[PDB]
Design a protein around this nucleic acid. Structure first.
Ligand SMILES: [Mg+2]
Ligand SMILES: [Mg+2]
Ligand SMILES: [Mg+2]
Ligand SMILES: [Mg+2]
Ligand SMILES: [Mg+2]
Ligand SMILES: [Mg+2]
Ligand SMILES: [Mg+2]
Ligand SMILES: [Mg+2]
Ligand SMILES: [Mg+2]
Ligand SMILES: [Mg+2]
Ligand SMILES: [Mg+2]
Ligand SMILES: [Mg+2]
Ligand SMILES: [Mg+2]
Ligand SMILES: [Mg+2]
Ligand SMILES: [Mg+2]
Ligand SMILES: [Mg+2]
Ligand SMILES: [Mg+2]
Ligand SMILES: [Mg+2]
Ligand SMILES: [Mg+2]
Ligand SMILES: [Mg+2]
Ligand SMILES: [Mg+2]
Ligand SMILES: [Mg+2]
Ligand SMILES: [Mg+2]
Ligand SMILES: [Mg+2]
Ligand SMILES: [Mg+2]
Ligand SMILES: [Mg+2]
Ligand SMILES: [Mg+2]
Ligand SMILES: [Mg+2]
Ligand SMILES: [Mg+2]
Ligand SMILES: [Mg+2]
Ligand SMILES: [Mg+2]
Lengths: 167, 131, 120, 205, 111
RNA sequence: GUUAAUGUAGCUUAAAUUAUCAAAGCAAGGCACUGAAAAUGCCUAGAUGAGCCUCACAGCUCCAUUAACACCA
RNA sequence: AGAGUGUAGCUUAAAAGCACCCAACUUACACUUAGGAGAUUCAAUUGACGCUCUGA
RNA sequence: ACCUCGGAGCAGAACCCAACCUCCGAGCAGUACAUGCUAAGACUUCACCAGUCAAAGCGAACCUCAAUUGAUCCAAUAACUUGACCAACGGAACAAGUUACCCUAGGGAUAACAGCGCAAUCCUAUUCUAGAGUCCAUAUCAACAAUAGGGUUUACGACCUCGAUGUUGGAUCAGGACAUCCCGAUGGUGCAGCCGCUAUUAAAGGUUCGUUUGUUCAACGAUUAAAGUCCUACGUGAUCUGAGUUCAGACCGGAGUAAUCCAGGUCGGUUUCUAUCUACUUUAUUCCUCCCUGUACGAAAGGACAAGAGAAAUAAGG
RNA sequence: GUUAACCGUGCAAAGGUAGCAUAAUCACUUGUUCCUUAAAUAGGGACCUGUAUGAAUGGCUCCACGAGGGUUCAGCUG
RNA sequence: CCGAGCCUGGUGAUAGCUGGUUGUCCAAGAUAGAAUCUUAGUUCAACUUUAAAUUUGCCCACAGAACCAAAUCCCCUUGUAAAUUUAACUGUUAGUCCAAAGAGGAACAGCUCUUUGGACACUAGGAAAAAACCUUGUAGAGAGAGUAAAAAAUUUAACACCCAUAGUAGGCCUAAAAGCAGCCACCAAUUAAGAAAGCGUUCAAGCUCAACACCAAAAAUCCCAAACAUAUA
């Protein structure tokens, strides 16, 4: 007995007669990349996944990278630091929102707060609880702070302009 | 139920391999195994040109098998004019080839002649030998 | 090896000349079969020996009514040779509680619900 | 070269494992060479059978001694004998496993062409010695042409369309209409009702 | 004469012991094999004789999935570095979907 | 027919691998010449096709050959 | 003159993934580690520069 | 020859699956020494015994292999432990020959004689033209092969019989088949005649006596028209023979330490029955002499048919 | 190795000696030859590969003898 | 009656072996194997019985089981009513043929060996008689009735009539090869006759053809029902 195949079979569009003229992976990390691509195709047979599932900014960037590429003489290529406070101050403006939505979706915030229906928080909210008198322990999007520090109301800033807040 | 309509979902036999003269009527040669000979009185320039030839074959997707080396000869200077004495040895590297396109041949050869280094004899031919 | 026969499903398909041959039609199928056994279950394998006992065809030439559902049709599709299927066609409908007492079979498969012993 | 070469008994690379007589190799139609290639006329095999080395010598003698090598040519379609046949010494009881290898055969099914011939002639030129060699093969065989083979297949096909009898073998056996699969074989679903055992029944549709 | 001997080994009685759909409790044997047939997927361990013992209680499943071998497995990485560019292997795997949740929280005291 | 045994310098024996000694043969050295005695040397696919290792060697595949068995109605 | 048009070598890429190069190992190739070079032809869907093709 | 364990095929897709069935292998080696302790759940070589796998935990880092083996009682030692090629491998703790001097229980479950099945072997008929036959396929013979038929060989099978189906030849009497030895009738011939060869038809009738051997056979002497092939429980032992083979004795050679043993040979070796039943119990051939005549035929040598007459001989009846 | 007296070569405790012979003596065997017969797988006398003869497991001849076992001339007798 | 006397006693020696095992009736009832000085046997498993407790057993559908054909397993619905478990047991475990996939043997056997399925050891009808094929099963009385399976068809080989002259004994090679020993070529005269397709010659020569023209059965005691082509399935 032989039932016919439903969907297009894998390795069906590569098996020619001239197999000495195919590209033929010489590595392992090429094959692992092309294999971990295949965890996303719909795959008609059976999956693990079924049962388990502007131009001014560009010109400014190409000028600023041109400046920083020639200025460091490349002396610290063969030991830089990349100051993290500056990186965070730029990341909260630019791709903080694009990343905190991922944290919300992995925590499942939208399937609890809004029953789904995701959104991108465009305004960063710097909230910090008063630990004694100093310091202030900031709450990020997924932090751990105990009910001891949260006995009193925290300090909230956002750098925006009429609002309402809910905890 | 199953052999069945996911039969052959994985078969590592037809995909992988197993285990003369390219006869090739009309398009006459489409050559078989040529051995190209880089001989020099230097060792290193011939080795460099062998590496360059190998990378050029892998760049233009021509298939090669073996970049083996014949035993290096020893000749003194021929003591022929007082008689004069200095040993200058000839090193030898040989790069095989397997395939070719026939119409393509002259371009590959021209790039070999054009990029050919200094004091290095190039020789293409066919095969019968042992190391 | 003599094994269990499995029939391809392009046999159980009616060509349009068969609707002239037998009176049935695909629109409005009969709801009930009448099965009568017309072959002994001996010299026939044990699965056919128990499918006949499941369908309740122990006595040959005895009619049983059965559902026209695909599960029961599939059980019939392994003993299709030992039996005789006729669609129970009803001129008058199902019997009422005062009509259960006087019914009969009337081969050609017409369950009449008023059976008198008098001519026409 | 326009002549059948010498086919050698007992292949020069011998066999050292004694295979069983896998008796599928005689039954039914051929999946192997049923067609003509670089030729015109041939031998059709209307039934299965083994071929010894004796029939090979018989064909190589009976075509070459009666064919003129300036006008006609001949090619085999069958290989040299490869299947070993095991034969005990005579006068021995049952027991003790299989005996030694005795000889070698080649199996041919029905419909597989055996000897193919062509050249600057016609079918009536070849048919004489072809029915000479064809009667001595160890099954029912026949001489055929590329034209007559096609006309015979047209007749065998037209008989599938001509019969008024509503019960074919393929209406009954595929459906198992009488529970008749108890009596039939599993190969009678695919061969058809034509083949029975070794022989091929050509008149039966 | 009977120059042959020795072939009196019995049958191994290996195969699928738990086909797809069966509810399998913890520690049960799913399959037994030589010369690997099914590979372990989720929550399926492997014994020394390539047995596929089930680790968590649930229902067994069978899925074709792409096979990425261990790198120190030198047996199949030579297959990997000889596969062509469009090649993905697709071995078969056995899983279990776990049925019971790991634990619920129960009210024990009022303090 | 079955087991078992054997394969050698040219002939026979040996040696637990490696391969001898003794005739045959090849030259020679002495009396007029052979012989004899000696002395040099020579002559072993160790009967087969592979090498698991490295094989008279140790297991086949062999191909010749040799004995025992071919049974108290 | 008209036409196909236009991302670095390629793209059912949108400043990217591949390709590519030089060392270090490898006879070499490769693998890998190290490093390297890079682009939306020019102004507000249109315009004029770049090839290619169709010409005399 | 084998006896245990493992892999592959038969057994193509859960599992299982025989064989004096086809092929390979195993009676180990190597590395760690947490090859530590405990403990849910399973599988399982179709029983069991055996085997297998194993999450959690305690304690510590931070096994490869296919098989690679042996139970209990026992022998050690203070303990943990360790002991068989017990390989007839689920193992009796230690035991071989020969019986024809044999005995008993049985077995047609199991062999020899016979019947039966088969038709490998055998025999015959065809199909096909390779080749012989000076040429010439077919007067005659026939290779490589093909298809049917026979059931006389040597086999194989083990279905009837072991609370007995008596055996090889011979005598006696034979019955049947025809695939005919002659006698009869034809056809062909590389048939001149006489002889022959061969094919069709024919089963009315007959098919010798001896020497040797137990002989059927075979060899040979003499004959004849010819000295047919077979089958009938290798016809027929309640008709007979027992010379062989086929008991107890015995030698010779050989094997064996010996008992003994030998399709190797040789001398000797009880062959029973009074008939119950069925059945049954009186119905012409051939050769040769003569003649035809030395005629037909051939060149002769040689040499007949058919027609006629006479003599026998056996068979049957008197 | 020259059917070899002869030579080489091992092994052995010794290498079957005298005799005798197709036998009562594995097989090849109805051996070969002469006598007997019209015809002799029988009998007698020789020939030795007896390749499994043989010396008190006794060997070889011979006088008498045998209800021995085979051969025979002559008579003779259903 | 001596391979070791006879008689008593141990002695009802023992016997995996043979034979026998005595009233009536009814119900359920068939053979995977594993070991074994064991294959003439026994133990365990399987099957079977009986009594119980308890719940699912069969049949099955999408899905699903591997790389190097028939089919199977798992499997809800569905039709049904059996199944599992406990308790107590014996007996079979020396089996045949048919169909199918195979293996050994001769692609022999009423042959041997496994697997799937039958029947057979169980009655009844049929294929003549009949274990195994086909019909059919749960029972009694009837001098009722409808059914199932159920009876071999073949009979065959005629065939052309007529006409024939030449370049030319086509070249080569052969003692000679003349259409026909073997090679090369295969044109051409008239209407039409091949540089010849079988013969037949030492070579020749003669016959033809091609062309015009004309219009399947054989064996042994005695064959084996009798027969019968035509009044309506
Ligand atoms: Mg096996
Ligand atoms: Mg077994
Ligand atoms: Mg079990
Ligand atoms: Mg752990
Ligand atoms: Mg045992
Ligand atoms: Mg005696
Ligand atoms: Mg005695
Ligand atoms: Mg007795
Ligand atoms: Mg019997
Ligand atoms: Mg019996
Ligand atoms: Mg017999
Ligand atoms: Mg001839
Ligand atoms: Mg039997
Ligand atoms: Mg008897
Ligand atoms: Mg009796
Ligand atoms: Mg006759
Ligand atoms: Mg006499
Ligand atoms: Mg006499
Ligand atoms: Mg008799
Ligand atoms: Mg008597
Ligand atoms: Mg009698
Ligand atoms: Mg006496
Ligand atoms: Mg009587
Ligand atoms: Mg003797
Ligand atoms: Mg006498
Ligand atoms: Mg007793
Ligand atoms: Mg017993
Ligand atoms: Mg009953
Ligand atoms: Mg034992
Ligand atoms: Mg049988
Ligand atoms: Mg003439």
């Amino acid at each position: 007995r032989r039932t016919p195949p439903l969907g297009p079979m894998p390795n069906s569009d590569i098996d020619l007669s001239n197999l000495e003229r195919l590209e033929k992976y010489r590595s392992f990390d090429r094959y692992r990349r092309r294999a971990e691509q295949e965890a996303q195709a719909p795959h008609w047979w059976r999956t693990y996944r079924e049962y388990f599932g502007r131009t001014q900014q560009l010109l400014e960037r190409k000028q600023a990278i041109q400046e920083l590429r020639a200025n460091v003489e490349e002396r610290a290529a063969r030991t830089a630091s990349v100051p993290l406070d500056a990186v965070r101050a730029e990341w909260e403006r630019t791709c903080g929102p694009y990343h905190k939505q991922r944290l919300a979706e992995y925590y499942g915030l939208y399937r609890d707060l809004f029953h789904g229906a995701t959104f991108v928080p465009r305004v960063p909210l710097h909230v910090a609880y008063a630990v004694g008198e100093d310091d202030l322990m900031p709450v990020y999007c997924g932090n751990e702070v105990t009910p001891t520090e949260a006995a009193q109301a925290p300090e909230v800033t956002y750098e925006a302009e009429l609002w309402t807040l809910l905890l | 139920y199953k052999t069945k309509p996911t039969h052959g979902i994985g078969k590592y036999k037809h995909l992988i391999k197993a285990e003369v003269r390219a006869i090739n009527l009309g398009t006459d040669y489409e050559y078989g195994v040529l051995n190209i000979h880089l001989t020099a009185y230097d060792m290193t320039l011939a080795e460099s040109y062998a590496q360059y030839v190998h990378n050029l074959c892998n760049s233009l997707s021509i298939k090669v098998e073996e970049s083996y080396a014949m035993p290096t000869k020893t000749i003194e200077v021929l003591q022929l004019q007082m008689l004069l004495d200095s040993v200058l040895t000839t090193h030898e590297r040989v790069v095989q080839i397997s395939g070719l396109s026939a119409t393509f041949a002259e371009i590959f050869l021209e790039i070999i002649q054009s990029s050919l280094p200094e004091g290095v004899r190039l020789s293409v031919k066919e095969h019968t030998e042992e190391d | 090896k003599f094994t269990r026969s499995r029939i391809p499903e392009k046999v159980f398909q009616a060509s349009p000349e068969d609707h002239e041959k037998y009176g049935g039609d695909p629109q409005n199928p009969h709801k009930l079969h009448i099965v009568t056994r017309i072959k002994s279950t001996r010299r026939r394998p044990y699965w056919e020996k128990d499918i006949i006992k499941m369908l309740g065809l122990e006595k040959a030439h005895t009619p049983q009514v059965h559902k026209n559902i695909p599960s029961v049709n599939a059980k019939l599709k392994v003993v299709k040779h030992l039996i005789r299927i006729k669609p129970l066609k009803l001129p008058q409908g199902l019997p009422a509680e005062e009509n259960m007492s006087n019914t009969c079979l009337k081969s050609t498969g017409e369950l009449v619900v008023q059976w008198h012993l008098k001519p026409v | 070269k326009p002549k059948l070469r010498f086919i050698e008994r007992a292949p020069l690379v011998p066999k050292v494992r004694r295979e069983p007589k896998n008796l599928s190799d005689i039954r039914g139609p051929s999946t192997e060479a049923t067609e003509f290639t670089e030729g015109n006329f041939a031998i059709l095999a209307l039934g299965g059978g083994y071929l010894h080395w004796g029939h090979f010598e018989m064909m190589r003698l009976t075509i070459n001694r009666s064919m003129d090598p300036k006008n006609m040519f001949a090619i085999w379609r069958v290989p040299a004998p490869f299947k070993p046949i095991t034969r005990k010494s005579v006068g021995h009881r049952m027991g003790g496993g299989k005996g030694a290898i005795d000889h070698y055969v080649t199996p041919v099914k029905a419909g597989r062409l055996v000897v193919e011939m062509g050249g600057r002639c016609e079918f009536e030129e070849v048919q004489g010695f072809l029915d000479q060699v064809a009667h001595k093969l160890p099954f029912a065989a026949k001489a055929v042409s590329r034209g007559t083979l096609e006309k015979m297949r047209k007749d065998q096909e037209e008989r599938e369309r001509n019969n008024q009898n509503p019960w074919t073998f393929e209406r009954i056996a595929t459906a198992n209409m009488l529970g008749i699969r108890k009596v039939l074989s599993p190969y009678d679903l695919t061969h058809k009702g034509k083949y029975w055992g070794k022989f091929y029944m050509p008149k039966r549709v | 004469s009977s120059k042959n001997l020795g072939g009196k080994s019995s049958g191994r009685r290996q195969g699928i012991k738990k086909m797809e759909g069966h509810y399998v409790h913890a520690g049960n044997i799913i399959a037994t094999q030589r010369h690997f047939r099914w590979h372990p997927g989720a929550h399926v361990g492997v014994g020394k004789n390539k047995c596929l013992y089930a680790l968590e209680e649930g229902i067994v499943r069978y899925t074709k999935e792409v096979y990425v071998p261990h790198p120190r497995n030198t047996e199949a990485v030579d297959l990997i570095t000889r596969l062509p560019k469009g090649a993905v292997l697709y071995k078969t795997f056995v899983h279990v979907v776990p049925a019971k949740p790991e634990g619920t929280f129960k009210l024990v005291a009022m303090l």
